[PDB]
PDB file of C-alpha atoms and ligand atoms in Angstrom:
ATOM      1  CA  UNK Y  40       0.000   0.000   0.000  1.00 17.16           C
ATOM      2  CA  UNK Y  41       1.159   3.535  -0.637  1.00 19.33           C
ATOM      3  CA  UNK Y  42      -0.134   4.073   2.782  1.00 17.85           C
ATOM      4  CA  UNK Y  43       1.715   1.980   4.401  1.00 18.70           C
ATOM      5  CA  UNK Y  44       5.265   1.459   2.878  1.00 16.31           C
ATOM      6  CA  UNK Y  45       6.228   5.687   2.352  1.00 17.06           C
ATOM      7  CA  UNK Y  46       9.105   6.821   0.541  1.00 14.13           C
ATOM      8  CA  UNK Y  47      11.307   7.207   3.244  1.00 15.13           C
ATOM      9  CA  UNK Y  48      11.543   4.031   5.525  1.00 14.96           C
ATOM     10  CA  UNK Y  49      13.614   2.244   7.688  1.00 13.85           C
ATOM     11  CA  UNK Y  50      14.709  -1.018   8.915  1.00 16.17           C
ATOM     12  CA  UNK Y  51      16.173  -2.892  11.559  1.00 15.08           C
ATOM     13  CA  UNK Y  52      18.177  -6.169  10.874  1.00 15.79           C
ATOM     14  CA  UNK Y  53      19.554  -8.931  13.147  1.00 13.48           C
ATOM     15  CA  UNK Y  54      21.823 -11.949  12.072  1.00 10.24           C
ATOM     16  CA  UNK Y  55      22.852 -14.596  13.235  1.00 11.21           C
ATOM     17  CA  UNK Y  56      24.839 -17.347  11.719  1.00 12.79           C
ATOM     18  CA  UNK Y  57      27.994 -19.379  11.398  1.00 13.84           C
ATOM     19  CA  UNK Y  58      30.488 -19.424   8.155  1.00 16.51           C
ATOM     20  CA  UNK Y  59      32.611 -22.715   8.534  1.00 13.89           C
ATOM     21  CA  UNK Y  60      31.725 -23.202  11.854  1.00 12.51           C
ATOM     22  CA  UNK Y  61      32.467 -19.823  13.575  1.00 13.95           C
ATOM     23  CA  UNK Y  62      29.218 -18.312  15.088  1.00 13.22           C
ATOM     24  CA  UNK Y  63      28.688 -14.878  15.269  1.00 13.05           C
ATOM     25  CA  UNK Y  64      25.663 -12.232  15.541  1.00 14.17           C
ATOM     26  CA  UNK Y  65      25.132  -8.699  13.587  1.00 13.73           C
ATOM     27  CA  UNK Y  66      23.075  -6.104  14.477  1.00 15.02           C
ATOM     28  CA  UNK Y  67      21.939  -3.139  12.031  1.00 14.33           C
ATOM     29  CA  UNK Y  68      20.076  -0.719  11.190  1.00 17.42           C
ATOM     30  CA  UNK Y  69      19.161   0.993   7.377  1.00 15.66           C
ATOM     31  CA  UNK Y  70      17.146   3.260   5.107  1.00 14.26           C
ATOM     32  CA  UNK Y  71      15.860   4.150   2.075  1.00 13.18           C
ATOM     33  CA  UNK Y  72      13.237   5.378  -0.911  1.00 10.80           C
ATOM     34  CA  UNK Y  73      11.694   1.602  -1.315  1.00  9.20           C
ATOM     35  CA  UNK Y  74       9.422   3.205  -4.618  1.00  3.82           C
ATOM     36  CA  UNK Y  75      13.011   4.431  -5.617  1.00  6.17           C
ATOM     37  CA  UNK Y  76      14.997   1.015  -5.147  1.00  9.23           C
ATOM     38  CA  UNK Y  77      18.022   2.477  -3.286  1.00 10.23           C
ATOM     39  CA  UNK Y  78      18.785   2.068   0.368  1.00 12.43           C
ATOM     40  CA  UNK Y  79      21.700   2.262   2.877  1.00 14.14           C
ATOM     41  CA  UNK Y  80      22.921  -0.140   5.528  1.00 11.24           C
ATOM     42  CA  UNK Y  81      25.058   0.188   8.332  1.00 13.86           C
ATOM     43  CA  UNK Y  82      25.783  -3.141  10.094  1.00 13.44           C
ATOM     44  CA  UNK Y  83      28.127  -4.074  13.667  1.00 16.57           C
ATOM     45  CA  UNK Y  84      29.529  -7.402  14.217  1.00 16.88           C
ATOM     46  CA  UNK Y  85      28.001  -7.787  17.862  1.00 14.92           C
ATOM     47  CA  UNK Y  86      29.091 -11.719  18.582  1.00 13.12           C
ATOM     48  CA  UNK Y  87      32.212 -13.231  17.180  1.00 14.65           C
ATOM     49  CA  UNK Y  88      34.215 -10.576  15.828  1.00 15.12           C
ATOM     50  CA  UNK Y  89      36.359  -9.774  14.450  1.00 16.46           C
ATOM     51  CA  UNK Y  90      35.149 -12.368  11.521  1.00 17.08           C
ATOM     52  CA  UNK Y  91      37.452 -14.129  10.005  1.00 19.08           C
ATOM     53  CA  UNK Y  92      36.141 -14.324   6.581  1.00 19.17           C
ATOM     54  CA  UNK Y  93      34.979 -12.175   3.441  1.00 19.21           C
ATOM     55  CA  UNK Y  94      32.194  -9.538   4.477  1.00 21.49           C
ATOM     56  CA  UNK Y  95      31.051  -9.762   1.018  1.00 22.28           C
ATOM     57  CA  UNK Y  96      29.558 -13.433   1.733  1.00 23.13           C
ATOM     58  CA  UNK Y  97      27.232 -11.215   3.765  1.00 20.13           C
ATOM     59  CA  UNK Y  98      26.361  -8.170   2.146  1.00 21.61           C
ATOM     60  CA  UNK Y  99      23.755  -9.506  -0.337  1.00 22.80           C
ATOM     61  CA  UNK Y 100      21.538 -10.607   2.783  1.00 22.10           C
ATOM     62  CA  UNK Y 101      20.934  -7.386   4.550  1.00 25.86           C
ATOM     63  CA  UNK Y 103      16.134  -5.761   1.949  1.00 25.52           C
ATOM     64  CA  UNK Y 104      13.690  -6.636  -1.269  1.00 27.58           C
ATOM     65  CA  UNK Y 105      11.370  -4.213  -0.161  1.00 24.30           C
ATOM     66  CA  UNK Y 106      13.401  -1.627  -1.459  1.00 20.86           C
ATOM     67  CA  UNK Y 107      13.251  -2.418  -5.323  1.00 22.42           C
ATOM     68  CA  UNK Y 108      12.080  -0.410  -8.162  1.00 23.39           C
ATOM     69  CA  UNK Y 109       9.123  -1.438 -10.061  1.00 22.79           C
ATOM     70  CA  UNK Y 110       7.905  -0.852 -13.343  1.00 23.57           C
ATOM     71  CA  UNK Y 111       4.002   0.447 -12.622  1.00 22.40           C
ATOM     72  CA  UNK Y 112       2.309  -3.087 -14.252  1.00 21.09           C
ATOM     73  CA  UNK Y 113       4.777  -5.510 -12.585  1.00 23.67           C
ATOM     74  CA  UNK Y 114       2.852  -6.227  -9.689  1.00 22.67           C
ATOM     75  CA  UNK Y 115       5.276  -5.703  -6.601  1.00 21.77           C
ATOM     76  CA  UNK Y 116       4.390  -8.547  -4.677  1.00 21.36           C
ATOM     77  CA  UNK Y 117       6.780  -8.448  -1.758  1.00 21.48           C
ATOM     78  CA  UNK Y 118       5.826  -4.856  -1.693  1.00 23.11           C
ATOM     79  CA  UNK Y 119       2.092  -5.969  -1.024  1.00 24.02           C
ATOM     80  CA  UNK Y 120       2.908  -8.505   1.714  1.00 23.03           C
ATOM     81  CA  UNK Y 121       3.147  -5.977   4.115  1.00 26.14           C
ATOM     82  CA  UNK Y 122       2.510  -5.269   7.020  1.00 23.75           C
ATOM     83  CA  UNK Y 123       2.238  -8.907   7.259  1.00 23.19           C
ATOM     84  CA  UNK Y 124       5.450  -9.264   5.304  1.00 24.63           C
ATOM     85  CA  UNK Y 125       7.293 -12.156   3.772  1.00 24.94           C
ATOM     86  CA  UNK Y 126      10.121 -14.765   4.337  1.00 24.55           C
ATOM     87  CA  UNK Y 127      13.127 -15.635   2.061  1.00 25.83           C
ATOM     88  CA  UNK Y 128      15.052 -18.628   1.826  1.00 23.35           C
ATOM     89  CA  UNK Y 129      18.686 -18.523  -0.168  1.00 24.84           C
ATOM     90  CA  UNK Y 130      21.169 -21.141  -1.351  1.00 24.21           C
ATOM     91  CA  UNK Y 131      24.757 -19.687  -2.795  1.00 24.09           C
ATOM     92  CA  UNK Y 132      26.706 -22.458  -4.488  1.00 23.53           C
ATOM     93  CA  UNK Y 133      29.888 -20.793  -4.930  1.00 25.74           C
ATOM     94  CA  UNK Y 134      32.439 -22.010  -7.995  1.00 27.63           C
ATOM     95  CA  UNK Y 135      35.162 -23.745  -5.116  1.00 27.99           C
ATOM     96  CA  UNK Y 136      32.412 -25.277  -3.231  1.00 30.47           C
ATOM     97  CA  UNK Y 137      31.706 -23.295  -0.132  1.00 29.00           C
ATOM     98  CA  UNK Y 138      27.660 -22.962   0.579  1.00 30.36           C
ATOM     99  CA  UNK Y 139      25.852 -20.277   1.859  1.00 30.64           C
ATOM    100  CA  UNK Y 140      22.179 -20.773   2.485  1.00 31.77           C
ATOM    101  CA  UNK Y 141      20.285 -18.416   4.489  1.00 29.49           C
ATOM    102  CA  UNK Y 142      16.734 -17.425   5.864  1.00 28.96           C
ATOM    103  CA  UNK Y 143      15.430 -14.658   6.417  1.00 29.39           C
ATOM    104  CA  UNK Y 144      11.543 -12.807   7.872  1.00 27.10           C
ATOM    105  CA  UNK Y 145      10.333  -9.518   6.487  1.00 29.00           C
ATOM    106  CA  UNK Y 146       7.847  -7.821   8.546  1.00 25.61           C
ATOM    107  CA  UNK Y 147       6.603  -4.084   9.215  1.00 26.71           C
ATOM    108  CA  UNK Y 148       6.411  -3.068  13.103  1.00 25.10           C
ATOM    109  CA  UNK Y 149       5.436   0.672  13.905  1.00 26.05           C
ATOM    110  CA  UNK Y 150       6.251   2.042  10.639  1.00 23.57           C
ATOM    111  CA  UNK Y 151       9.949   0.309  10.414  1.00 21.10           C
ATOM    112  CA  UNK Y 152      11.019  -2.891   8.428  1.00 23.69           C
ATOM    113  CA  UNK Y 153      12.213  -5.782  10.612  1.00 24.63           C
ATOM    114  CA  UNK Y 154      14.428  -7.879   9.403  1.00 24.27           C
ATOM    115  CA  UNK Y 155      15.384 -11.283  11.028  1.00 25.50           C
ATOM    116  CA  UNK Y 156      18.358 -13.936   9.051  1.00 24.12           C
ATOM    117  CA  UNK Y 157      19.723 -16.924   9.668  1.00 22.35           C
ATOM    118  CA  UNK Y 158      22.957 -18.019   7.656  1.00 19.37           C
ATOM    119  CA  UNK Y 159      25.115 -20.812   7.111  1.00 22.27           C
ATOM    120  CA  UNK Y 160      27.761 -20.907   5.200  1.00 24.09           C
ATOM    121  CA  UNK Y 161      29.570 -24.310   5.005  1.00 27.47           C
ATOM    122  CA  UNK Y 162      32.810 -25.510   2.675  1.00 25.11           C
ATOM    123  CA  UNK Y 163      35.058 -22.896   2.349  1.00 24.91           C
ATOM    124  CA  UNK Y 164      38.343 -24.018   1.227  1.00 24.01           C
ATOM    125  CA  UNK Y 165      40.298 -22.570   4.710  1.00 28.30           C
ATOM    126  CA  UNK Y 166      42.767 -21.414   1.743  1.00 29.74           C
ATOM    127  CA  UNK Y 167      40.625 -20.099  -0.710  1.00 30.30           C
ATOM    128  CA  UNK Y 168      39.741 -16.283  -1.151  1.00 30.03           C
ATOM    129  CA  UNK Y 169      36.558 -16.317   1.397  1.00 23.26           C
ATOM    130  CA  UNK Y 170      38.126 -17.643   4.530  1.00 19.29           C
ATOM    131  CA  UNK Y 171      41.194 -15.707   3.323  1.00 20.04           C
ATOM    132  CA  UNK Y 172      39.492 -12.343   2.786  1.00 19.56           C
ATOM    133  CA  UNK Y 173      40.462 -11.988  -1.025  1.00 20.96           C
ATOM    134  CA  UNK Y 174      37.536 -10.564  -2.311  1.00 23.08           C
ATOM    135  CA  UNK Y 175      36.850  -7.070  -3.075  1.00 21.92           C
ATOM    136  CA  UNK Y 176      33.118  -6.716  -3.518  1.00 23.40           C
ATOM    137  CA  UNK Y 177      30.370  -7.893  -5.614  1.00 25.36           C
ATOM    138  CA  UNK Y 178      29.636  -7.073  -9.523  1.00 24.82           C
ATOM    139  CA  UNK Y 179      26.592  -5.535 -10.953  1.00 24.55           C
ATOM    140  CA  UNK Y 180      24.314  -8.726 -10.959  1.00 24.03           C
ATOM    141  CA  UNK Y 181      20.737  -9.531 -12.851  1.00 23.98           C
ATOM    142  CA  UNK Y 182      18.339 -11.468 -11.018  1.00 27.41           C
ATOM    143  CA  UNK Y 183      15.796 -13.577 -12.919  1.00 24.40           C
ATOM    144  CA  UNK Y 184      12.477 -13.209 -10.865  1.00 20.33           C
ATOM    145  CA  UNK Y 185       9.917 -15.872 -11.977  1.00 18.16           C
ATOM    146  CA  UNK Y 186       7.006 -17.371 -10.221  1.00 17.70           C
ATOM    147  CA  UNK Y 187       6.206 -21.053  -8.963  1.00 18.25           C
ATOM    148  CA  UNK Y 188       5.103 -23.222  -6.628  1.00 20.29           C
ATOM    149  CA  UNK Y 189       3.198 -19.878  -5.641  1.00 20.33           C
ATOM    150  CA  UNK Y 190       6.070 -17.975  -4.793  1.00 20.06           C
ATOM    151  CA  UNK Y 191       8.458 -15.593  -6.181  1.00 21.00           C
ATOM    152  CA  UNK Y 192      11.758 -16.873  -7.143  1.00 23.14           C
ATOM    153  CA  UNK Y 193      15.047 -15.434  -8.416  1.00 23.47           C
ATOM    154  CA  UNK Y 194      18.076 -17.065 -10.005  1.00 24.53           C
ATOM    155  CA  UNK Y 195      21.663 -15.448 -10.359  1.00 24.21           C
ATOM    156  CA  UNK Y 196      24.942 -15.767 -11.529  1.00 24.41           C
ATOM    157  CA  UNK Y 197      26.721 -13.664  -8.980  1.00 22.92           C
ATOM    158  CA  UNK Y 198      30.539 -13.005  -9.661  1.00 21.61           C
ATOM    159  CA  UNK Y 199      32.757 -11.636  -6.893  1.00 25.02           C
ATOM    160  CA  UNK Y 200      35.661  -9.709  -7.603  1.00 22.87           C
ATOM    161  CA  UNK Y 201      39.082 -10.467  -6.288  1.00 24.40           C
ATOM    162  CA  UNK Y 202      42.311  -9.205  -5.014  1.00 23.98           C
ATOM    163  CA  UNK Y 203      44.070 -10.424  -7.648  1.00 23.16           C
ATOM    164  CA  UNK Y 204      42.206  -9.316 -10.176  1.00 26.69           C
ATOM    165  CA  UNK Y 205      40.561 -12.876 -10.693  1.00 25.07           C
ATOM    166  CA  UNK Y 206      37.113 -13.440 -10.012  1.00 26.00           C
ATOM    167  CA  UNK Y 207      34.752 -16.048  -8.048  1.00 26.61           C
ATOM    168  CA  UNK Y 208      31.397 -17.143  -9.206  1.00 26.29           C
ATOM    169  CA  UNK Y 209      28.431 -18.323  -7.302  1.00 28.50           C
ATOM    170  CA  UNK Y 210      24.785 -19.825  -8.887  1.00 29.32           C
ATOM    171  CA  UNK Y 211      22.360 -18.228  -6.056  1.00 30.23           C
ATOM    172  CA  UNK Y 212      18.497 -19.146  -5.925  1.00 30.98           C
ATOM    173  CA  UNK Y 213      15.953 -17.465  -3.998  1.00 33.35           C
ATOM    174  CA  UNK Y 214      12.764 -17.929  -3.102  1.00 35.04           C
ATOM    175  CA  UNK Y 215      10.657 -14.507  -1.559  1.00 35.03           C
ATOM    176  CA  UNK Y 216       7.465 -15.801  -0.054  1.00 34.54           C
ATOM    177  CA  UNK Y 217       4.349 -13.414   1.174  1.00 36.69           C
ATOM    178  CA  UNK Y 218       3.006 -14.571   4.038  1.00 36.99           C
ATOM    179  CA  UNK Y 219      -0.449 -13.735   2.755  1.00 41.79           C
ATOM    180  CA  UNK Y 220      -1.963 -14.070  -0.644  1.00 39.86           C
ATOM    181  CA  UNK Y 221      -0.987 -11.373  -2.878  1.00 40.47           C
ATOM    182  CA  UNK Y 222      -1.016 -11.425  -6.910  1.00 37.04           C
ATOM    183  CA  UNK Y 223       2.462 -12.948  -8.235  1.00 36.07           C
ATOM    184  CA  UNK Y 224       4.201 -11.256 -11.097  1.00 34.84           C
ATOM    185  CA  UNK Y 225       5.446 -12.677 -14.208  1.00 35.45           C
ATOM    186  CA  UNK Y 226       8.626 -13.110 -15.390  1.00 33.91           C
ATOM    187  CA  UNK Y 227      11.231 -10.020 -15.055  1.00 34.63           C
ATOM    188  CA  UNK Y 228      15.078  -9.191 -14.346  1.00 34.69           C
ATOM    189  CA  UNK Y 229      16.143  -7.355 -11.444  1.00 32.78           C
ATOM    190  CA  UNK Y 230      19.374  -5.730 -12.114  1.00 30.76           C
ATOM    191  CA  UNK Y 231      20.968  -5.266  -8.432  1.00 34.11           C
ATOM    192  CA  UNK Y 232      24.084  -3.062  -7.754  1.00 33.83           C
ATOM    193  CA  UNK Y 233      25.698  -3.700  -4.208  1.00 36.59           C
ATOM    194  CA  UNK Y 234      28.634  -1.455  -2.820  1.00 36.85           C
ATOM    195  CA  UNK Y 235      30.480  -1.599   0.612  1.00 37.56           C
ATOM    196  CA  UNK Y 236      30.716   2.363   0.826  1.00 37.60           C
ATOM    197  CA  UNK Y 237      33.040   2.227   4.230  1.00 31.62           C
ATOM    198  CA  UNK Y 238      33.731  -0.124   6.778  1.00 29.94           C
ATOM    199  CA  UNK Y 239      36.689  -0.161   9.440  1.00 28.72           C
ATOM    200  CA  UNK Y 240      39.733  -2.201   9.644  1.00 31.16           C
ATOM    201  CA  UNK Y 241      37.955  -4.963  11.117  1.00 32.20           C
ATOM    202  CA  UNK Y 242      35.051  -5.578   9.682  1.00 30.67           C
ATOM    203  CA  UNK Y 243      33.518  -5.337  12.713  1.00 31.30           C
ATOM    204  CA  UNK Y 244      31.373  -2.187  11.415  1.00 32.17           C
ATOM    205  CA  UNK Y 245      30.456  -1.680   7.397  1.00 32.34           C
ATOM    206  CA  UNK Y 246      28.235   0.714   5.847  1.00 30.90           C
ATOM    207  CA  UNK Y 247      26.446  -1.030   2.717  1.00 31.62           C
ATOM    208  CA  UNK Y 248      24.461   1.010  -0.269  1.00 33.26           C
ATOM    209  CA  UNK Y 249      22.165  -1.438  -2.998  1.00 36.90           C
ATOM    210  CA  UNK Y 250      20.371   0.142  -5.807  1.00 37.13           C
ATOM    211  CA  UNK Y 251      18.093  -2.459  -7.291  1.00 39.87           C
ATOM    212  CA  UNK Y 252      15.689  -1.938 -10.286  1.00 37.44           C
ATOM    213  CA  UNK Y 253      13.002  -4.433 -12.187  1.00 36.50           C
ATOM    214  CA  UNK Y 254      12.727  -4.440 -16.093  1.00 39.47           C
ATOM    215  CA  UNK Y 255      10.635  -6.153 -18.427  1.00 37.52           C
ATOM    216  CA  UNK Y 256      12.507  -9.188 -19.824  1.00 41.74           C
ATOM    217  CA  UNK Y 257       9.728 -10.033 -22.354  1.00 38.61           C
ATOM    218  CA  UNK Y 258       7.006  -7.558 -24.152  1.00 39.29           C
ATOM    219  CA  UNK Y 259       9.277  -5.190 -26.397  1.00 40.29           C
ATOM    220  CA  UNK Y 260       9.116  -1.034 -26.774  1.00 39.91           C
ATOM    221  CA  UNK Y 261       5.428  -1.073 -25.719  1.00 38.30           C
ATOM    222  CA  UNK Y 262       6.625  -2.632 -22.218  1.00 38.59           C
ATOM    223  CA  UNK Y 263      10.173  -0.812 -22.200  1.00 36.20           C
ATOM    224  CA  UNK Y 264      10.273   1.758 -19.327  1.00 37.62           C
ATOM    225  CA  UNK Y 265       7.162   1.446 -18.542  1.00 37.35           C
ATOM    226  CA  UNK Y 266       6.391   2.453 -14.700  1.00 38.11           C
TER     227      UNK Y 266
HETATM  228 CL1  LIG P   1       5.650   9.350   2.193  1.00 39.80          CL
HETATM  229 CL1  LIG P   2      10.485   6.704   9.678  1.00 42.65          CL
HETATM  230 CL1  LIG P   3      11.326  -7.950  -7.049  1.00 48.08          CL
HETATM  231 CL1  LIG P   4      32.059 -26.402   7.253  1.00 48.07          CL
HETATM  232 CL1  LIG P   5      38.327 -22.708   7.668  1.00 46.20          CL
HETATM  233 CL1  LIG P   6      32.037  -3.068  -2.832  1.00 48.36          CL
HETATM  234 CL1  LIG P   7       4.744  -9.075 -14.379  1.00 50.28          CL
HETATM  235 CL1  LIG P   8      11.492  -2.091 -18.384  1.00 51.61          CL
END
């Protein structure tokens, strides 16, 4: 509802998890223009830090509510609320580390809340995760697509390294309202992610997304549209 999510709004994430075994807990806090698809994150290792692995295995879980949709591309997890919706994630990355993650949506006096669970599994101890080789995510396009009445997305999500190299991981989503609302159709959601600061440790990082839907299918009559 354009009541109910504004322009400006906020949100409030917790996360727990454990990446080859270490457990640890984050706390954060963010904001954005959710009509606009651009938001800001800042997140603080609270339990088990300083990490000892690649932020960037976490960035991509800390806000769908904050995408921008063409006007006839129903926005379903838009609609969910206040009620909200839950997410489930599996990252198969190229070495064979794992990363799947849950996650609940919900709106509580006018603020997002945002509640994940990861675990990431299989990290080569040498390889550029556990190592902290990577240097941040590129520009990705997620293929939305209904079924099984949900809303899921499918990426090939390349990471940037140190060495110039880079490191690939299939990802599949699946974004599920907790109520009935209209699913879309088919449609690509291209999704930048930037760490904008963070300090030595890791141990508190400020995040910015931009994310945007476009038709995939329907030509110059369905271009731009909205
Ligand atoms: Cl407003
Ligand atoms: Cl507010
Ligand atoms: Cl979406
Ligand atoms: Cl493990
Ligand atoms: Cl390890
Ligand atoms: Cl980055
Ligand atoms: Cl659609
Ligand atoms: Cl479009």
């Amino acid at each position: 509802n354009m009541a109910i999510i504004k322009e400006f709004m906020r949100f409030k994430v917790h996360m727990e998890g454990s990446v080859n075994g270490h457990e640890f807990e984050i706390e954060g806090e963010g904001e954005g223009r959710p009509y606009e698809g651009t938001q800001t994150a800042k997140l603080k290792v609270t339990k088990g830090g300083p990490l000892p692995f690649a932020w960037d295995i976490l960035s991509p879980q800390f806000s769908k509510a904050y995408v921008k949709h063409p006007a006839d591309i129903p926005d379903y997890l838009k609609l969910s609320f206040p009620e909200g919706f839950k997410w489930e994630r599996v990252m198969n990355f190229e070495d064979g580390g794992v990363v799947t993650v849950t996650q609940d949506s919900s709106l509580q006096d006018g603020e997002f809340i945002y509640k994940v669970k990861l675990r990431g599994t299989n990290f080569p101890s040498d390889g550029p995760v556990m190592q902290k080789k990577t240097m941040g995510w590129e520009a990705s396009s997620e293929r939305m697509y209904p079924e099984d009445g949900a809303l899921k997305g499918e990426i090939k999500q390349r990471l940037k390294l140190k060495d110039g190299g880079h490191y690939d991981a299939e990802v599949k989503t699946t974004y599920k309202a907790k109520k009935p609302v209209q699913l879309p159709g088919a449609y690509n959601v291209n999704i930048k992610l930037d760490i904008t600061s963070h300090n030595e440790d890791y141990t508190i990082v400020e995040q910015y997304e931009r994310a945007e839907g476009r038709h995939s299918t329907g030509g110059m009559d369905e271009l731009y549209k909205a």
